[model samples]
Target chain A: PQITLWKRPLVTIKIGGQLKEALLDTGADDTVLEEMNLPGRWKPKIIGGIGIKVRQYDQILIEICGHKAIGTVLVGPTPANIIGRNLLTQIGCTLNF
Target chain B: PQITLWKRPLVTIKIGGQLKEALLDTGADDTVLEEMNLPGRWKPKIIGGIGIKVRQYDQILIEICGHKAIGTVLVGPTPANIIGRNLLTQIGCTLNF
Candidate 1:
C-alpha cells in the first residue's frame, strides 16, 4: 500500500476482537493504544513528552490492514491510538518519496 | 527515497539558512520547528496535545532533502523539529509498504 500524505494516514486495526482506527505515526517510537483491558499481565512504563505514564503489554497480536503482527503495545491516555514504528516495522511499512 | 522503519526517519532540512535534522512525522497535523528565529510576521496560535501555544508563520519556505515547500510552519517548544503532512505532500512524500 502506498499511502499519500493528503489525509491523516489512518488505518483500521483489529485488537482483542475489536476494530479501531489508528494513525500510522512515524514520529512516535512505540505503539500506543487507548486504555483497554486485555487478557495479559502489564507493567507500568514511562515515556518522553512530559513524562507520560502508560501500561506496557508485550507480545500482543494486532491486525493492521489484514496483516498480523505481534509486538509490544502501550496502553495509555493518548487521545488517538497510534501505530508507531515498532509495529509498523513488523508489518513492513515504510516512508517513501 | 524509501525510508525503512529500522531507524528514526530523520532527514536533513535547511531552514533560515541553517541546516538541521528533523523527523518526518505523519501523525502531526502541522509542522513544528524548535524555537528559532525566522523572518516575517507571525501570530500566536494553539494546537492540540494539552493545548500547546506556538507561533504560526504562514507561507514559510522550507527545504527538505533539497525539495522546496512553502507552507504554514509552527515554531514553539517542540523537543524535535518535524516535517508534517502539509509540507510532506508538497515534496511528494508518501508512506508505502
Candidate 2:
C-alpha cells in the first residue's frame, strides 16, 4: 500500500499496549516517542538530530499498522510520536514520489 | 513515483542553479538546506524543530526530480539537506506501506 502526501503521514501504533499516533518519518534514522514506561532497561544515550539531541531506548517492540517491529525509540518532550526508517522498513513502507 | 525506505528518503535537487542531495522529511514542516547564497529576497524567520531553531528563506524556488516547487526553506549548519512536506505535496509524492 502507498501513503498519500496530502498531509503528514500519521498512523496508529501500539506501544506497550497503549495506542498512539506516529508520524511516518523516512528522514529519521530511529523512531521517537513521547516519554513512556516500556518494559526494558534503558541506557542514558543521547541521539543527535538535525540540530538537537535526544534520549533513546534501544530495541523497542512497536506495533505499527498491525506489524510488529523492533525499533530504537527515542524519548523526550516531543510534540508527536515519530516512526522512523527502522520500523518503516520492517513494515515494508516507503516514500513514493 | 514511490520512494524506498531502505535508506533516508534522499534525492537530488536544484536550488538556485546548484545541485545537492536532500532528505525527504515528512516530520518537518518546511525544507532545510545547507548554507549557500541563492538569488532571492528572504526574510529572517526562525523555525523550531525537534529541539532547535534555524533560519528560513520564504518562498524559495527549488527543483527536485525535475519538478519545481516554491516553498519555505530553512538554511543553517545542517548536516544534510531536507525536503519537507511542502515540496513533497507539490511533487505529488507520498508514503507507501
Candidate 3:
C-alpha cells in the first residue's frame, strides 16, 4: 500500500504552566513530553531499552489542531511531542498544511 | 487544581519498516518524528526558531495504543516520538500505566 505523509504546523501547548509548540507526528505511536519542558515535581517512568532504561511520565492535558484532550504523558529527553494516530482520529480530519 | 502526572510504558514503533520504541508525551501539543528514521525520499519543512527553520514533513501513519491514524508527520532532529494529548482522546482513555 502507498503511504501518504503530510505536515502540520507546529502547535503550542501549556505544560507545567508553560506554553510550548510541538510537531504533530502521525508516524509516532505514543505521546511523549520532553523533560526540559516539564516541571520538577513530575516523576519519570523508565522504559527498558538498549543501554539505560528510558524514563517517561503520563497523565497530562494537551492542546492542538484547535482541540484539547487529557491523556498520558511521558517525560524523557525528547525535544517535542509527536502526536500519534490515536489522537488524530478524534479530530476526524486529515493532515493538511 | 492539582495536576496528576502519571507514567506510561514506552512502546516500540515501526518507522520505515524499522522497529523503534518511543515515549508517549501528553504535555506536547503536536506530533514530531525524527529525521534519522525517515526515508531519503521524504522532504523536510523548516519551522523558524532560535537558529534555523525547523524542517518537517506532512502525512504519515503512526501505530500506538493498539490503534493507528492518518495524520501529519514533521521531520526534524527530535530524539523520539512524543505522543500528545490530542491523539490520546481518540482512544477514549487517559494515562494510567
Candidate 4:
C-alpha cells in the first residue's frame, strides 16, 4: 500500500497484544516504541546522540496490517512509536516516490 | 520510484546548485541538512528535544531527482541530511506497504 506524505505515515501496529499507532520511519535504523510494559526481560541502553535511555527487548514479535515479524524493540520515552528499517524490512514495507 | 528498505532510502538532493545525499525521513517533521553555507539570511533556532542549534532558511529552493520545490530548511550538525515531510510532500513522495 502506497502512503502519501500529505499526512504522517502512521500505521496500526500490534505489540504484546496491544494495538498502537507507529510511524513507518525510514530514517530510523531501529524500531523504538513509547514506554510500554511487555512480558519479558530487557536490557538498559542509550540511543541517539543526546543519549535517550531505552529498554532493549530482542527477538520480540510485532504485527502490522496482519503481517508479523520479530526483531529488536526499544521501549523508551519517544514522542511517538516508530517502525524503523530493522523491522520494516521484515514486514516488507518501503518508501516510494 | 519504489525504494526498498534493504538499505537507507537515500537520494541525491540539489541545494544551492550543489548536490548532496539526503535521507527520505518520514519520521522527521522538518527537513534538516548538514551545516552548509546557503545563500540567504537565516534565523538561529533550536530543534529536537536534544536542542540542536540550527539555522532556519525559509522558502529556499531545493531539487530532488530533478523535481524542485521551495520550503523551509534547517541547517544543523546532523549526522546525515534528511528530507522530511515538508519537502517530501512537495515532491509527492510516499511510503508503501
Candidate 5:
C-alpha cells in the first residue's frame, strides 16, 4: 500500500500593515485573520466570537511554489492567515506534506 | 498610485465522502468540514453551531503553489475547508493571492 503523507503550504500576510507568516490549515473550516493587523479602510463585523466578522475582499494575491494566483480574500481576526482546502482544491493540489 | 491586489488560493476537498470545491474563507472564525464527508472512523461532537465541534487532527498534508507541507488539521462542519489567519502566520508567506 502506498503511504500518503499529508502536508499544507504556509503563507505570510500583512496584518495591521505588518507582515506575518502563518500556517495554511486546510482542515480549517473558516477563514481567520488578525484583528490587530486590519487596515483602516476595511471594517469587520462582530459575530459568534468577540472578534470581527469574516469580510470578503474583491481579490487577493498569493504566491506558492514560485507560482502566484489571485483569489477571493476574507478578512477576520488574528495576526495570521489560514488557507482552507476549498481554495487549495481550485489549483489542482492535495494536502500531503 | 500603487494598488495592492489581494487574493487567496483555492482548493478542493472531499466532503461527505464526495469531492467538492469550496472557497477558502479566511474571514470565518472556526473551521468547518462537510458533515457528509466525515469518515466513519471520525466521530464528531456537537458545539455551539448546528454542526459538530472542531476537532484538531495530529497532522494533515497539503500542496500549494506546487509546494507541499504538513500542518495541524481542524475538522468542523460544511462540505469544504476554510483555512484561517492563525495558521497562515505560522508560515512565511503573505496572503497576496
Candidate 6:
C-alpha cells in the first residue's frame, strides 16, 4: 500500500491501547506523542529540534499502518504526535520520489 | 527514485548557498533549517512541536533531492532542517508501504 503525502501526512495510530492521530515524521528520531499512559520503566531525557526542549519516554509500543513495534515515543507539551523511523521501518515504509 | 529509510532519514540539501544535512519530515507543515541567509522579505512567526517552540521564516527557497522549491523555512536553535509538504508536493514525493 502507498500512503499519499497530505499537507500534514496525518495518520491514525494506536499506542498503549489508545487510538491517536499522529504525523508520519521521517524527520523525527523518535515518535513523541501528546500523551500516553504506559506501564513500565522509562528513562527521562530531553529532546529538541523545532526549538523548545521536551521530555522523552523510551521502549513504548506503537501500532502504525497495521504493524506493531516497540520503540521510543516522547511525551510532549505539544500537539505534535509523530511516528518516527523506528516504527516506520518496522512497518516497511519507503519514500518514492 | 526511491529512498530507503535511514535511522534518521538524513539527506543533503542546498539552501541559502549552503549544503547541509536535513530530515525528510512529512510530519512538518513547513521546511526549516538550522541556519541560513535567505534573501528577500520574510515575516516573523512561531512554531513548535516534539515539545518545543521556535521561530519561522516564510517564502524561502530550498533545493532538496535535486529539486528547487519555495516555501516557509524556519530558522532555529535547531539541528532540524526539514523538507515539508509545500516542497514535497511540488517534487512529487510519496510514501510507499
User: lDDT (0-100) at residue A67 of candidate 5?
Assistant: 41
Off by over 4 Å in 1: none
Q: Which lDDT value does model 6 have at B24?
A: 76
Residue-level lDDT of model 1, residues A1-97, one tens digit each, is: 8899999999999999999999998988899998888768999998764116799999999999888999999998888899999999989999988
* Model 5 spans with C-alpha error above 4 angstroms: A1-19, A35-52, B1-97
Higher lDDT: candidate 3 or 6?
6
Whichever of 2 and 6 has more DockQ, that candidate is 2
Q: Show where candidate 4 strays beyond 4 Å.
A: A49-51, B49-51
Error of 3 at B14 (Å): 2.4
Question: What would the per-residue lDDT of candidate 4 be over residues A1-97, giving only the tens digit for each residue?
Answer: 7788878888899999899998888888888999788767899988773118899999999997678999899998887888889999997887766
Model 4 chain B poorest ten-residue lDDT run? B45-54
Report per-candidate DockQ: 0.63, 0.66, 0.05, 0.63, 0.06, 0.64
How many clashes (backbone N, Cα, C below 3 Å) per candidate? 0, 7, 39, 0, 81, 1
Instruction: State the lDDT of candidate 1 residue by residue for B1-97, as single tens digits.
Output: 8889878899999998989999998988899998888888999998774117799999888999889999999998888888999999999999887
For candidate 6, give the docking quality class from DockQ: medium
**lDDT per residue as tens, model 3, B1-97:** 1112222335565555656665554444455656555433455454421112234444556665456654555656665565544444443323221
Q: Score residue B74 of candidate 6 by CA lDDT.
A: 73
lDDT of 6 by residue, A1-97 (tens): 7776666777788877788887777877667777556767666667666543455666777888577878777675666677877778877888887
Question: How well is each residue in B1-97 modelled by candidate 4, as lDDT tens digits?
Answer: 8788989888998998789998888988889998788777899988773218898999999998778989999998888888899999998888777
In angstroms, give how far residue A37 of model 4 lies from its true place. Answer: 2.3
For every candidate in turn, the CA RMSD to the true structure comes to 1.5, 2.1, 11.8, 2.0, 10.7, 2.7
Off by over 4 Å in 3: A1-97, B1-8, B36-53, B95-97
Highest-TM-score candidate: 1
lDDT of 6 by residue, B2-26 (tens): 8777666667888878889877778
Q: Candidate 1: what is its chain A TM-score?
A: 0.94
* Pairwise lDDT winner, candidates 1 and 2: 1
